[PDB]
Amino acid sequence: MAEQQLYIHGKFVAATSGKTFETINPATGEVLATVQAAGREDVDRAVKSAQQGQKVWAAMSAMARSRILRKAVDILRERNDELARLETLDTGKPLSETAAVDIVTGADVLEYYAGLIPALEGSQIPLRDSSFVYTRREPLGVVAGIGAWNYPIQIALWKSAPALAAGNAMIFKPSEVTPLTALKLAEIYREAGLPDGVFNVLPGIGAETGQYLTEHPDIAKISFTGGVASGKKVMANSAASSLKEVTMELGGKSPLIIAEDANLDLAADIAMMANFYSSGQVCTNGTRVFVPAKFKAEFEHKILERVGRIRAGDLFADDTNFGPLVSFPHRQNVLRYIESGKSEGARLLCGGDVLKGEGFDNGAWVAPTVFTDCTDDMTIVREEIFGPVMSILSYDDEAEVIRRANATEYGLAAGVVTPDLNRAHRIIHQLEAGICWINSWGESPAEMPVGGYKHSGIGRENGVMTLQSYTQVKSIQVEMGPFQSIF
Amino acid sequence: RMAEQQLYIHGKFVAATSGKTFETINPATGEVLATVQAAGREDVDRAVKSAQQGQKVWAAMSAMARSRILRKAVDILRERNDELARLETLDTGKPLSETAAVDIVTGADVLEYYAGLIPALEGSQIPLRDSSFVYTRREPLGVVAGIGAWNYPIQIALWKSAPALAAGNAMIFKPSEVTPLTALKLAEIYREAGLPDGVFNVLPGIGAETGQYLTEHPDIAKISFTGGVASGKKVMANSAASSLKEVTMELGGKSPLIIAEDANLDLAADIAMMANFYSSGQVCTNGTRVFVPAKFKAEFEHKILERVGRIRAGDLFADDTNFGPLVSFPHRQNVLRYIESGKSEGARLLCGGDVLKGEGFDNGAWVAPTVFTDCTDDMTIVREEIFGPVMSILSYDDEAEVIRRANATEYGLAAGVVTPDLNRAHRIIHQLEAGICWINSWGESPAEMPVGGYKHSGIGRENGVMTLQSYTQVKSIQVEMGPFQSIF
Amino acid sequence: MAEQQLYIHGKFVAATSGKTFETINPATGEVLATVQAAGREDVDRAVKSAQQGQKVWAAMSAMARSRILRKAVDILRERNDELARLETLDTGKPLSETAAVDIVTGADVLEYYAGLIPALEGSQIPLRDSSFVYTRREPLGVVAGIGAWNYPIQIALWKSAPALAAGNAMIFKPSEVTPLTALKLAEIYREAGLPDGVFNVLPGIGAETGQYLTEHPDIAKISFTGGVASGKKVMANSAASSLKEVTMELGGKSPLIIAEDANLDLAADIAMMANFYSSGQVCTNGTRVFVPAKFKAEFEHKILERVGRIRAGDLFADDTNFGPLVSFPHRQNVLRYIESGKSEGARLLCGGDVLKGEGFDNGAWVAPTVFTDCTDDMTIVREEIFGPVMSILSYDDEAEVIRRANATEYGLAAGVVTPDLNRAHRIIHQLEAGICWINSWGESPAEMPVGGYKHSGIGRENGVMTLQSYTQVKSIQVEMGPFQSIF
Amino acid sequence: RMAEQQLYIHGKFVAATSGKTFETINPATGEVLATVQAAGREDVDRAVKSAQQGQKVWAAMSAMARSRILRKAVDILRERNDELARLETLDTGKPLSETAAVDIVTGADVLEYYAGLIPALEGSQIPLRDSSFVYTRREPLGVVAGIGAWNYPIQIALWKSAPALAAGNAMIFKPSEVTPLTALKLAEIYREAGLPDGVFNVLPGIGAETGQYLTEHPDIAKISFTGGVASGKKVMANSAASSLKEVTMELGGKSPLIIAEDANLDLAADIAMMANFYSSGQVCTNGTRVFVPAKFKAEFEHKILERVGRIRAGDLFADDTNFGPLVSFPHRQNVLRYIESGKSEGARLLCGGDVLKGEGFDNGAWVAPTVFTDCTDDMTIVREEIFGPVMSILSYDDEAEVIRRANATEYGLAAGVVTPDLNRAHRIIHQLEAGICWINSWGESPAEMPVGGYKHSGIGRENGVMTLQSYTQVKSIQVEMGPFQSIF
Ligand SMILES: Nc1ccn([C@@H]2O[C@H](COP(=O)(O)O)[C@@H](O)[C@H]2O)c(=O)n1
Ligand SMILES: Nc1ccn([C@@H]2O[C@H](COP(=O)(O)O)[C@@H](O)[C@H]2O)c(=O)n1
């Protein structure tokens, strides 16, 4: 691939920063492409382009906007397999995942918001015969989205779909680890008829390009997906610069509670899907699995059985369902967590090492890893690993497990396995998390708002509420009576 | 003098463990109203633990049980309106003619409004397929903190605490160090109304310490702040860096008042007066850039002079007084520096511009009502919020021009237009970059109407149904009744 | 008491019909009172009064209306016991019910709507830069409620609360069987500050006073509670006369489904409360109880045990929990249904006869009655009895009981008893009823919309939606661009 | 000539078993366009069992699957716009200049609108206490019936079927016996888009038989009817008497157009023209009572006559034709009876009042554009809907008077005001008793905007989000997780 350029105002354009970076294929170590990095002057160009495109976009009818987003949806469906293969090359996720999930659910959200544009309404409030109020849900203007590397094009769609549907232009910065699919999406939008400037894509690094966006005085909102620490830095700079509105989708340490009446085959299946999809690189993963003491030994055997069925290998093979981690530096961090678990006395049930042999020595592979006999003070239990590392924790009673599930600064997701009507709702209602699954894990419908409690996030994505949160309310009073001054 | 004022934690007054105190002054006389204890770091932690325990009791009650308790507080506030207004006048220097008609009346209106909406707070249900559906809960945030400003102390305490409590939260409120007294009275009223202990705690103190300890505390889920634009940026930064708190910010503005070429100039002048000189100019939404057509500027200036001459400064408890001192001598000094900036930058002084002198004024920080004209967009008095009684009059030629100039600011709080024309009123208002827009009026802020700033003037909103919802957090719950399939 | 008069424009006034009727105390057979009947001229006077009052009422602020309704609530709480005693004399329901339910839940709904008045808002819809639409939710004007006799004051509150909260005036006609508490409510409203004419009460008979209301050209909506047959007459006349909006809360034959995993003590408690409260005179009663064949014998035993604890007697006694039927003519109809059950081959498990002895010979008593071995073709199974008659039906599988529960023209309520998460939601989602209870029966929160599918009703009561349904939408387009004529 | 037209049941054309047929006439020539089979009792029974089967398949699909199928129907309607418009012109007599720009365009706009809203159709969740909560489902009604009118045949079929299908129902549509042809084309288009067989069935026939059989059928859950005020009352009665069906009714009106004393009279004249002579006056919302201030009446009359003189009747397929014949010869007879009453009751005829004559008109149901003035509130032409091209001009003196006279009617469908004044426009409109109100325009009916009548002009609404919800029924579900308490 040739020097990948910036995408500004409906065309690829060379960056004026003079800086570049490389994205690596995590399966081979090869350079996928050299990518231009947006400089401070490039960000300002992108903002002025976005201001001009947004005015055209907002002036269109609601249904005209809806039709253009729907054309982008149709193109995404057509190009699913091509885009999935590129995503696999950039992220290391198996094609069996990227071709079935990444673009499908990204497009599902764009399709959803495309249809809701005409339903975006203000309100009207009578005060008295001589005065009333009405409100408008106006675009914020130019907004910025900052993506993460685990679901690059899905995240770009989940941020840009409500932003565009609400009448804004978005400047999107993909993660430096995985910048390629965002640039393809930018071409797809314009091909669908999106006006020039409404979706600009600026590859770059967080310390420079990301910061230039968070500081710009004419960007009205920042939406960020990433780690808890990076989020705090982003939200601070966005505030100190121009008091921007903020959305944050950060990591978690989500609990999966297995009830005493749970079927352990189902619970083990849910625990598997909550830990080893995308090689464990999912913010919502149920990485603390609480199991009753009386069932723990049997559950551990059922986990070992299923871990043995995991099929690592060629990411383009049909039967491969486990990939390398997104990068070699990230594998290093995941390995440090694994060593921490060993040094603190957690019992390694399986995995714990890199994969070796033909087809693995050149990739950032980590074996599916399960620790058991875990306790609430362990580093692997307290901190998000963002790798394929399950922690199993024994518990005795329902009140106890609720307290321990909630005793964390994280708040993203949670789940319970139980056939009992009262227990399922009763437990779920007490858990301090924004995304809660009963007898399942991971499904995130376009209709369902998702985001974190406590340190796991600010605001929400998806659902009707996220379309409204990309508008700002203007209240208008019409006074038809005589105005009275006290002077 | 009043008795020494303590912290209010868990349904009773309690001594601070900081060992620190400050004084609140009567802005009209300079006398010490009271010595006030300042909450330390340990006091904030005690307040948070009290709030956590109270919130659980409050949230477990029925919706209508909560509604009835807030309504009892409303009834008390109506009965004690005049007494609370007199205290507010002593602490702020605002005339009783204002405080007895606006401050508690509109604060209680918002509490009364939210009290009735508690039972209407609902989540959603979304079918996915025959075998699965989603439902959502609007759950309390938990413990939230409000940080008040000094210009409308008890109104702000009510506008923040009413939706927070109605949504099932406990709130720790920190009043401005300038004006702590009515917030402590409000805490007693809530308890008398039946609010569980800990649900509304009040921590007087100074911003550098008590305010910071609240924004840093790991177990406070949301900060709501009212104040200046600069102070706002600092609060929002500390709230994010510490524990990623949800935030609401109601900051200042430089709001434009646009007088159309077809406006009646008596109405326009009355609106401009009320948009600049209420509460002695100490109002975030004031219309401090008055745009008038060139052809009408001379006549408009004359009508402003007539009305400014009628402003009545004097005894703040007298019925005919409608203008008070500024809240402090340091704040007046800043307003005086802006006025001197207007003179040196070439704006024409139409009236006022000086401190008030003589018996009854020497002990207060009074500034005469001030009007500048012949102003231009580059002047400091036109670009920056003064927060004093200083009107800037700007001439303009055409509608496209005035919309551009009205919007060419980092502020975004309020705006208004004066015109009898249907098309012009809606057409102009729709293009203005502000959250609060008034047509042929100024200042009215109904409990139903969400209010807040665009751009640097704010984050989020207050009042209206949406502010009840914004004090909850959404939990989405998927019920999967079909057999779960694992790909491993 | 005296000769009960009409209530028009804030005062008691003599009827101009020249006609009266009597309401009987169902416990003694004695005449409680003679009540004047509103004629066609009385209805026209009530309507003109309502038009005048509604204009005053709607011109008030929203919070002014809220406070007045709240004062009525405070009065109702204070006079709960007094009002309940009057209700017991008129209806025959035990004081243990009327003092705990009738006024309490009537007032709860009024209290609920009082608080929602300020939240009643229209909408605003941008079309293009030069045109927008806004809507107003305007009062209907004058509406009429026609109450039933089983819950006289509760029904008066449930109809009048949303109607008044929406800015309307209501003319209320109580059932001729039970007119007394409705007149008390009219006094309470005026004492609370309700403008004269906003709530007028016209006692009379359905054949005359009710028909005059449904025919009046200046009444905008009729809300009716009663039997299915009477409802069809009312809704037709409302259509033929002036095309009125209509709400109908009619009877049902609601199924109670006991699952194979149900606790039979719980199922029996639910079945008892679903059949014998208010002596079986409740539209929502679960009068078809479906029980699995394998448990039928045990369930019947548990029902008989609980039936033996039912305490009929002095309606003002604390421990009395069962009363006479509302009238002797109604008892005659209930007895005919019981004899049909006997003759069609249903097995009589208990009851089936009037009660005899000192204190019962003078009242319209029917013993708690249970039939079992019932089949879907029996008259007692297909038709609403509106008396204390439980029908127990055996079933074998889940698909069958859903088909049989739904195989009816009625659609009011339904319920299931089961501890299983999937079974509770799965079954309830398939039942064709508007009011569904899981592991409970009867609770009707002010927040919860209630009403019938199929022949059991039109529209809903309670919930936010019922406040909205007492307004009518006006859409207003503001065209700020130049209008183009093609002529 | 066209082939004999059959019923459309379960995804295919099928012969009626009634043994009866009727003819639809081309109103421009008097010729038979087609012979059309009429559905009997048994045909209606068969259509219902088909609809019951199809609805189950349709409702079981996901929301977005339903959305995509309706969007494909939209795409076909856009592609086939001109062909469908030409057929509508043949059946109705409306000029192609109208049908190709409005009828299918706005019909498809509403289908497109509801297609996108399907995934947003949500129930509610209500917490009661920690141990119990309520949630609601918005379930399909099942099989619903739509009964169309003849003035906008395919638009009405789309406005009724779009929310009904989008909400998960099947609809059986009966077109007017006057204009059955475009509804049958719509049924084929729906199937081509993937609509499951049975979800949209079409039963041509006459009101006394096919219409009544539908309103009486026990397994139809809701009836939506558009037509005349009298026919509506009969439909609503039979629907109640049979099985207590939910009802929607869009009936006629006598809508007032109020010209204010400050109105520009050219704008007022253009609005009045569009409010009276579009579709040859056959529009339920037409502004047939034009209220003009006395001081402007003579001049207003002159501007109306000038614009009436520009009306171009002729070949309905010509670009410049903008006026057509009435839909049928019996309908012209009724319009002529109303015109004669206006003359006999003393109203002044300004123009028109007779049929059009000559080559190209003698065989069509033509009535000249007609304007009466000096009208009074007691005249038959002022009190009753004519549904032809007859404008009544009424003088007035003051605003209170015209509001009272505008409202002094049993009709309530639409209304409008012409004024440049902000206060006058909103003030007057807020007092008018009509569901559809236009300020400085007439006739536009956005898919987003609920429309329907006050008083005798209707029950319920069409279009907007509320109409999607009104084609569902609410089920409230209480989950009790606490121990149930029996008093027995
Ligand atoms: N929830 C998470 C956790 C980590 N990450 C990514 O992994 C990197 C390494 O993780 P930490 O910086 O959290 O140690 C982050 O900088 C970020 O790029 C993420 O994108 N989302
Ligand atoms: N919008 C504003 C602006 C200023 N202020 C007050 O004024 C101070 C700023 O100093 P001056 O207003 O004296 O220039 C703030 O720290 C705050 O106490 C406020 O409370 N709200």
Ligand SMILES: Nc1ccn([C@@H]2O[C@H](COP(=O)(O)O)[C@@H](O)[C@H]2O)c(=O)n1
């Ligand atoms: N659901 C029901 C059923 C009957 N009823 C009353 O009972 C009458 C008919 O029932 P009976 O034939 O049992 O007397 C109705 O006209 C009405 O007065 C009622 O008010 N609600």
Ligand SMILES: Nc1ccn([C@@H]2O[C@H](COP(=O)(O)O)[C@@H](O)[C@H]2O)c(=O)n1
């Ligand atoms: N609003 C209206 C008024 C009349 N009509 C049609 O006109 C008929 C009434 O006869 P005339 O209109 O020919 O007088 C109705 O039965 C109906 O076919 C309509 O479809 N909509």
